[PDB]
Enzyme design. Sequence first.
Site, PDB file in Angstrom:
ATOM      1  N   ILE E  15     -23.832-102.077 -33.326  1.00 46.33           N
ATOM      2  CA  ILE E  15     -22.442-102.322 -33.452  1.00 46.33           C
ATOM      3  C   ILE E  15     -22.325-103.425 -34.800  1.00 46.33           C
ATOM      4  CG2 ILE E  15     -20.175-103.293 -32.562  1.00 46.33           C
ATOM      5  CD1 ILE E  15     -23.077-101.819 -30.430  1.00 46.33           C
ATOM      6  N   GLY E  16     -22.951-104.340 -34.552  1.00 39.89           N
ATOM      7  CA  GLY E  16     -22.921-105.501 -35.486  1.00 39.89           C
ATOM      8  C   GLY E  16     -24.096-106.410 -35.503  1.00 39.89           C
ATOM      9  N   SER E  17     -24.091-107.561 -35.699  1.00 37.46           N
ATOM     10  CA  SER E  17     -25.030-108.620 -35.715  1.00 37.46           C
ATOM     11  C   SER E  17     -24.802-110.057 -35.594  1.00 37.46           C
ATOM     12  CB  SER E  17     -26.118-108.735 -36.889  1.00 37.46           C
ATOM     13  OG  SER E  17     -26.870-107.182 -37.008  1.00 37.46           O
ATOM     14  N   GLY E  18     -25.570-111.056 -35.727  1.00 40.97           N
ATOM     15  CA  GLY E  18     -25.339-112.524 -35.762  1.00 40.97           C
ATOM     16  C   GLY E  18     -25.776-113.260 -34.576  1.00 40.97           C
ATOM     17  N   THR E  22     -28.865-109.167 -33.039  1.00 49.64           N
ATOM     18  CA  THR E  22     -28.321-107.936 -33.306  1.00 49.64           C
ATOM     19  C   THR E  22     -27.762-107.448 -32.034  1.00 49.64           C
ATOM     20  OG1 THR E  22     -29.236-107.817 -35.474  1.00 49.64           O
ATOM     21  CG2 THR E  22     -28.393-105.919 -34.455  1.00 49.64           C
ATOM     22  N   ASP E 128     -19.893-123.537 -30.161  1.00 49.52           N
ATOM     23  CA  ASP E 128     -19.981-122.741 -31.083  1.00 49.52           C
ATOM     24  C   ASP E 128     -18.781-121.952 -31.242  1.00 49.52           C
ATOM     25  OD1 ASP E 128     -22.410-123.005 -32.780  1.00 49.52           O
ATOM     26  OD2 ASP E 128     -23.470-122.176 -30.773  1.00 49.52           O
TER      27      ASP E 128
HETATM   28  O1  LIG Z   1     -20.946-108.094 -35.286  1.00 53.80           O
HETATM   29  C1  LIG Z   1     -21.207-108.440 -33.993  1.00 53.80           C
HETATM   30  C2  LIG Z   1     -19.983-107.956 -33.385  1.00 53.80           C
HETATM   31  N1  LIG Z   1     -20.257-108.159 -31.857  1.00 53.80           N
HETATM   32  C3  LIG Z   1     -21.147-109.133 -31.239  1.00 53.80           C
HETATM   33  C4  LIG Z   1     -21.052-109.151 -29.885  1.00 53.80           C
HETATM   34  C5  LIG Z   1     -21.562-109.506 -28.793  1.00 53.80           C
HETATM   35  C6  LIG Z   1     -21.758-111.182 -28.929  1.00 53.80           C
HETATM   36  C7  LIG Z   1     -22.491-111.972 -28.329  1.00 53.80           C
HETATM   37  C8  LIG Z   1     -23.154-111.354 -27.059  1.00 53.80           C
HETATM   38  C9  LIG Z   1     -23.166-110.054 -27.136  1.00 53.80           C
HETATM   39  C10 LIG Z   1     -22.358-109.018 -27.809  1.00 53.80           C
HETATM   40  C11 LIG Z   1     -24.041-109.804 -26.010  1.00 53.80           C
HETATM   41  C12 LIG Z   1     -24.511-110.921 -25.300  1.00 53.80           C
HETATM   42  C13 LIG Z   1     -23.918-112.033 -26.075  1.00 53.80           C
HETATM   43  N2  LIG Z   1     -24.146-113.093 -25.874  1.00 53.80           N
HETATM   44  O2  LIG Z   1     -24.989-113.570 -24.890  1.00 53.80           O
HETATM   45  C14 LIG Z   1     -20.126-107.722 -29.687  1.00 53.80           C
HETATM   46  C15 LIG Z   1     -19.956-106.983 -28.546  1.00 53.80           C
HETATM   47  C16 LIG Z   1     -19.999-107.317 -27.266  1.00 53.80           C
HETATM   48  C17 LIG Z   1     -19.341-106.827 -26.211  1.00 53.80           C
HETATM   49  N3  LIG Z   1     -18.852-105.712 -26.337  1.00 53.80           N
HETATM   50  C18 LIG Z   1     -18.489-105.272 -27.507  1.00 53.80           C
HETATM   51  C19 LIG Z   1     -19.111-105.789 -28.824  1.00 53.80           C
HETATM   52  N4  LIG Z   1     -19.821-107.337 -30.988  1.00 53.80           N
END
Ligand SMILES: OCCn1cc(-c2ccc3c(c2)CC/C3=N\O)c(-c2ccncc2)n1
EC number: 2.7.11.1
Lengths: 278, 278, 228, 228, 280, 280
Positions: E15-18, E22, E128
């Site tokens: 889906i994305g990264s960062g 990822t 953050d």
């Molecule tokens: O470009 C990146 C976009 N993007 C980042 C996340 C994300 C961000 C942080 C964390 C997780 C997933 C999983 C664990 C976590 N922190 O522990 C998501 C996302 C998370 C859940 N449902 C839909 C999307 N989208």
Amino acid sequence: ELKDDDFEKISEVFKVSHKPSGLVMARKLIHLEIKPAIRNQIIRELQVLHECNSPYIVGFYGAFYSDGEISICMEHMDGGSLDQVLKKAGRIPEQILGKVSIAVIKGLTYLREKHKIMHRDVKPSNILVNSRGEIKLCDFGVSGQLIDAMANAFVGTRSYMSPERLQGTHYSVQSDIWSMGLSLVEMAVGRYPIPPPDAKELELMPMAIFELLDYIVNEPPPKLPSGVFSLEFQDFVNKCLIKNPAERADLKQLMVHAFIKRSDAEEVDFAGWLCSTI
Amino acid sequence: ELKDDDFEKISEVFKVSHKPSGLVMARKLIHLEIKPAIRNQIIRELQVLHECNSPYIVGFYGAFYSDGEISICMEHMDGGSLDQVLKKAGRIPEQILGKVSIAVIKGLTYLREKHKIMHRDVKPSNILVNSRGEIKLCDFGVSGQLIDAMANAFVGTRSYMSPERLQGTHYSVQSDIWSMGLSLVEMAVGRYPIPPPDAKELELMPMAIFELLDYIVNEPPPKLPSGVFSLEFQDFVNKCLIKNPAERADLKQLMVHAFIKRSDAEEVDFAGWLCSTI
Amino acid sequence: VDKEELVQRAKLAEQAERYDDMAAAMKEVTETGVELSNEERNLLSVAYKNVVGARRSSWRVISSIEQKTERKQQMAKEYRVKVEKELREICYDVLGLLDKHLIPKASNPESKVFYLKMKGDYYRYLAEVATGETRNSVVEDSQKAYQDAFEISKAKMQPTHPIRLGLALNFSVFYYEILNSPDKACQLAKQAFDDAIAELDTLNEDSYKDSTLIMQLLRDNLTLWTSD
Amino acid sequence: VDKEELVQRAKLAEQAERYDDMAAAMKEVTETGVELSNEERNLLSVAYKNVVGARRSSWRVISSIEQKTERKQQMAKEYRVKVEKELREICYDVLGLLDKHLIPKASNPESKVFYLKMKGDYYRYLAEVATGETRNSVVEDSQKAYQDAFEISKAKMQPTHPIRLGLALNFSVFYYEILNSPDKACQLAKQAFDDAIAELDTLNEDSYKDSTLIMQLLRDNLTLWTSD
Amino acid sequence: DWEIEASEVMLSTRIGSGSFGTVYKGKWHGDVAVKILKVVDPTPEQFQAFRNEVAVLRKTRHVNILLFMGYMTKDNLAIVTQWCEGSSLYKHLHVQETKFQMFQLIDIARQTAQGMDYLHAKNIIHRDMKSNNIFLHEGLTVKIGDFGLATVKSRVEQPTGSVLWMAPEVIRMQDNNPFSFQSDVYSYGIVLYELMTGELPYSHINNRDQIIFMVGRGYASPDLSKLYKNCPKAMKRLVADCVKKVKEERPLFPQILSSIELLQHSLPKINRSASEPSLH
Amino acid sequence: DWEIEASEVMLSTRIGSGSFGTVYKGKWHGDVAVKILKVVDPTPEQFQAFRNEVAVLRKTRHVNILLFMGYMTKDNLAIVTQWCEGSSLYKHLHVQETKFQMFQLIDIARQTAQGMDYLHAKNIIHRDMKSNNIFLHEGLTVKIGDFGLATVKSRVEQPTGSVLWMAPEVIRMQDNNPFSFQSDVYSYGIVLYELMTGELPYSHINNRDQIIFMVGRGYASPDLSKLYKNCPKAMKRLVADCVKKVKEERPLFPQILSSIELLQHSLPKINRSASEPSLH
Ligand SMILES: OCCn1cc(-c2ccc3c(c2)CC/C3=N\O)c(-c2ccncc2)n1
Ligand SMILES: OCCn1cc(-c2ccc3c(c2)CC/C3=N\O)c(-c2ccncc2)n1
């Protein structure tokens, strides 16, 4: 009109007295979630219970639906119920049992002749004697919708229930009569009719629900020893307790019993024995 | 037409060669979330970068938007960038620095005369020499929308940036010239222009970003020692590095410098020194 | 002056949800004789589709009530007569306009395909209520227009364009609801949907999103048909 | 036979969302001269309210466009003329029916209150567009009918009944939108809402739920007015 | 505890990264999301950050806080959490550009404020907070996203390479431990600012190293006039008080929560005055 | 850990009761729900049940599983969890009587099945699955409710006074440990049955001690013909297989989940065939 506003709690199904009338009153806080449209039905038949009074039946007062609960407006009784009084006192002599038997018999006949409805449940905790010494059996199966709500309910620790009304959906008043006979036997012995206990316990005077029901449906109803009970009493209660409805003691042969006449003729002041227990 | 389909990864911003043309190709996988309507804009100016070629500028190829990312189609270079080559080799002599200076000067003038746009960023990692020995400076600030996306980006470990373009929104090409002068000084010394280090390290040849920026804006730009650098070289790079834009070395006086003429006249094969480093 | 003014009136009306107004306005637009562009024909489509859809929903609900069923049955029947008269009037106007000014003067292939699609749609809407020789004639004409549109699309039109896909959607629904041949609908919808699958990424994202929506609709209704 | 048949037609139409039909049907119902019951008057209310609300929304959106603004301004103005003519025709029919067969023959107080409420509502809808002496006359008549309805309610009607509360809602909106006196609306709505608060539990749950909905609406719009 | 076997997880799509990894739309008892390190190696620093991430996520159980289902160490190390319908709030603001009515926007602020109050209650600094972290599960509900450098009190500062949300005192980095609840409050205020302006903070500023200096020295400030015209004035004053450059005058999270609750109690939900509704 | 101070929680209203306590709509960082023992005393048996409840809730972190925020021991002991919008599923079926389209109903079944699969994965028997437990948070999402007698493997049976959902082999009580995953599966099947009939199981049976005997001896069985006419046939066969009187032939939860996923892939979402939509 009646409401829970003028209700002063006293003790304990909460024992909450009526404020304006000056009468100590009792509320049954048996509550669960039902469709309100079904909830419409219950009050009208409770009104019919209020308009009927018998010298061996509980005091009836109009009930109502409170903020999410169904309450019942019944009379006070220092005797409470039969369960705790038998637990404290232990066992009960023949005379008291016979008088309770005639009380419940004539009360259920009063029901059958007035409200045209069967008990639908009989239980020793539902048997109860007034502080001045009057048996005031209560909480009948008068209201269909309440029984429907109670279909979804707790599990009965000891369902003193007629096996014929259990196995087959063909049911009759004789089934309730068998139930009350079992209640009488239980209050006589002072314990649940498990298979006859040790001769030690008889000389002195945990099991799962489903296997208990199996025992009731399969094994014969427990017999009454002749060393602690009069022959007529045990014979007649056994006749009332027969599983085959053909020889079940219908109302007429219920009044026919000689020990019924002895209980009518004998003098037993329930208040005196209660105070001795109290 | 160009696409990421005919892209064979080789090494590492991934070094992914072009399949059909037989040319080793490089992709810049700098990706972030932008509105696609803004994403429409970037490709057209990259086409303009493709239609311009200079003997001291990177090879330009048409870029495109892949499945969620912005890639850049640039040429191959075994020299990679300047950062790692200076890290491995340590320091750099005057001649190589002067030739890089004339390369970047004429490349940015080529930009200023062709694309009518300023660098908008200069960085030694963005300075890079071809395997056969050609300085091929790349990744200009040509596209406004890419710079807008890069507004929301990481933190720069060492922002070799002109303080006048920092403090005041009034900015000019002389600011980029100051930036490139700082880049030249950094590649000369081999370390970030922290205040002049110990005389030990000079004889041999962790700090937060915000206070570094404060040092740049407040303290004078670092001077160049005369014991390791020719007097003309250090004098001219300092002139290029003055904070006051009035005496900043504009393009004309950039070519005026005598050491520029020495670098033009001198013979330094970048390939030979690279292989010695390689 | 007339055409652009009426078009702006149509846009004002679609922002106003009142429909008879741009119905008449676009009737006058078509009768003028100017070659309609993409925006004008799209507005024609939206306006006519919704002005007939309201009455279509009314007929559907009253027919459901009729199936739910003595005097009430008679009044539902007479009201059904009324709504059928309304649909017949409006759709007959639509088709007359189409075969008067739009179809004969349609030069570019895409507008021809569009008009044939609309004609088939309204013939289908009549078939929804038509019975006897009426049903026979309307069904035959609808099928003729439908096969014509599909042939011209497969001859000179993009397979993954929105018009051809929605075309196929309406073909499939026609086969199910009217022709009562669910199997033929199944294979035609599936094969057109696979043709859409093959060249999904050939076009840009702007067409891609609407194409994805409508092929999701195709997946949905084909699963509906195969569910039985 | 006529009245019950037309009423069943009205129910069929409300299940069909087509509105002109029971508009005419209830017009004929009222002109007959029979004393309308609760269900029939409620259906009258719903039908007329929605048939005017559609056009009211149309006028609101076109007026917003007009505020967004040269030829387009002229065509928005002429379309506003059209929609105002439509609203005037339909509302004038409504009020004529009310003061012809409903109000004069209304014996029970509740139906009188209901009719006065409807009359005030449609006078308000006219005031929405009326200007000059038209606005003066319609505003005065609306206020007279309004104060009449409130007086008869406070004299012989339940304070916490749905009709009296929704009455108060419409009073408050009238004071804000038309009389442009937000303060008076504020205190009247608040005092009526407090009267509703006091006797909230006097009535049964069936009235209680709708009463709660509409006093939630009162809380919402009074907060809207005090937010400024 | 929350250990996760490598084979069970069915990773689907990038889906994305960062933020140290990822994100993949795995499958472990229904939809999940997996944050995974791109490099297979177990670098000790990233390992320790991962351990802190595990501990802090285990410290949280709130509804508006991302539901950490587990952490897997075998193969490439990862975190598996609830899959959130819809993308992050950053996308819903500046990529989807879907309109948020002030009711919905203030609801989002209220929910995320409750979340921050929860993190602070158990003594965690998010450290953050951004707009990329906030996730909008369906029904306009909110979940606070990754807590990669979010840590407990532990009584290290990292630029984390995320500007426009970092606090000036966090930027200045004078005391070597400039991470306080008020830093998170200022991040919250910046999120409110971007929610109620429709764009990123400091739009006129462009260069990244320009904007870091401008917000750091304090020469630049968020332009409050750039906010939406239609918004409650109490909310405007709360944003201004929350974005105060000086630390001690920014409001602690229970107080901002109280202010938001007051706002909810005084919310004009409908701009127009609705009248008698069409009965039943 | 999840300890909760007595003063902070702001209990509001008695929504209902049941399962070793009564439920209040407290306030601890936003809306919560508190399960509280009516009697103040710390009876050792109820205390131990409370401790097991704490441990098992700490074992769970799924999205479709109720989010246990904490447990408070001071004063009268309680559990604080997420407040769920809308009442329980029992209310939404037989008190609200709100219609559930087969799409929505099968979605509810899928979500709750994922939840049960999660409980079973970490080796927990819910032991008490009913329709009163299932909660329907807004957006048609599901959460499995209280786990009061739900316990881990621990390799005690209690009637819990809840009939019409208890399994016959659980009713029979022969081995003194008749609590298996298949018991939970049968509870799941009963929930499906009541979802897809619109009434409680065994409607014609009335008396409670009658119905316990009828389902126990097996004389009575759920009337499959009583289900809704409109429903996918695969779902009907799954309900029948899940309600099998014999234990070993009831499907383990991953398999029922696979069957439900197949059903989702073959779901006729729209009964009518939608045509070309009104463009934009
Ligand atoms: O470009 C990146 C976009 N993007 C980042 C996340 C994300 C961000 C942080 C964390 C997780 C997933 C999983 C664990 C976590 N922190 O522990 C998501 C996302 C998370 C859940 N449902 C839909 C999307 N989208
Ligand atoms: O008649 C019963 C009504 N009812 C019971 C609960 C409930 C049930 C179990 C548990 C909790 C609350 C809290 C903890 C728990 N098990 O641990 C709820 C409810 C829970 C959450 N949001 C809304 C409603 N309503």
